[PDB]
Design an enzyme around this catalytic site. Structure first.
Site, PDB file in Angstrom:
ATOM      1  N   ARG A  18      11.316   4.774  28.546  1.00  0.00           N
ATOM      2  CA  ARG A  18      11.752   3.402  28.778  1.00  0.00           C
ATOM      3  C   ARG A  18      13.281   3.295  28.739  1.00  0.00           C
ATOM      4  O   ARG A  18      13.854   2.555  29.533  1.00  0.00           O
ATOM      5  CB  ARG A  18      11.011   2.408  27.863  1.00  0.00           C
ATOM      6  CG  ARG A  18      11.456   2.339  26.395  1.00  0.00           C
ATOM      7  CD  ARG A  18      10.684   1.240  25.644  1.00  0.00           C
ATOM      8  NE  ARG A  18       9.372   1.702  25.150  1.00  0.00           N
ATOM      9  CZ  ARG A  18       8.673   1.116  24.165  1.00  0.00           C
ATOM     10  NH1 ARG A  18       9.018  -0.057  23.649  1.00  0.00           N
ATOM     11  NH2 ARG A  18       7.594   1.695  23.657  1.00  0.00           N
ATOM     12  N   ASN A  36       6.103  -1.514  27.152  1.00  0.00           N
ATOM     13  CA  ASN A  36       4.877  -0.708  27.128  1.00  0.00           C
ATOM     14  C   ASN A  36       3.712  -1.652  26.848  1.00  0.00           C
ATOM     15  O   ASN A  36       3.709  -2.380  25.857  1.00  0.00           O
ATOM     16  CB  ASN A  36       4.959   0.442  26.113  1.00  0.00           C
ATOM     17  CG  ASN A  36       3.582   0.980  25.715  1.00  0.00           C
ATOM     18  OD1 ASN A  36       3.233   0.977  24.539  1.00  0.00           O
ATOM     19  ND2 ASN A  36       2.771   1.447  26.650  1.00  0.00           N
TER      20      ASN A  36
END
EC number: 3.6.1.7
Length: 91
Positions: A18, A36
């Site tokens: 990420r 997420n």
């Protein structure tokens, strides 16, 4: 100008996939967020020009890091946000 939403699955984490995608965002001055999902995917949403957004899609899809994608979905829009940073949900 344009926006995406992207969802990806695979080894799409490990320590900071990420973070990696938001490095690639900044590298092409996209602005947006990464998350997420509880369903296990990673999800990304950002504004930018078409070439920047698509080059970013390739950067995620290629799985250039140790983390890599095995399935991807993308949606696109013209709905600019006024976003001026990248952001990371503490998922």
């Amino acid at each position: 100008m344009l926006q995406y939403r992207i969802i990806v699955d695979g080894r799409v984490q490990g320590v900071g996939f990420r973070y990696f995608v938001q490095m690639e965002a900044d590298k092409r001055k996209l602005a947006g967020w990464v998350k997420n999902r509880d369903d296990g995917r990673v999800e990304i949403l950002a504004e930018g020009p078409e070439n920047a957004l698509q080059s970013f899609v390739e950067a995620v899809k290629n799985g250039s890091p140790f983390s890599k994608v095995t399935d991807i979905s993308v949606t696109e829009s013209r709905s600019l946000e006024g976003h001026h940073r990248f952001s990371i949900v503490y998922s």
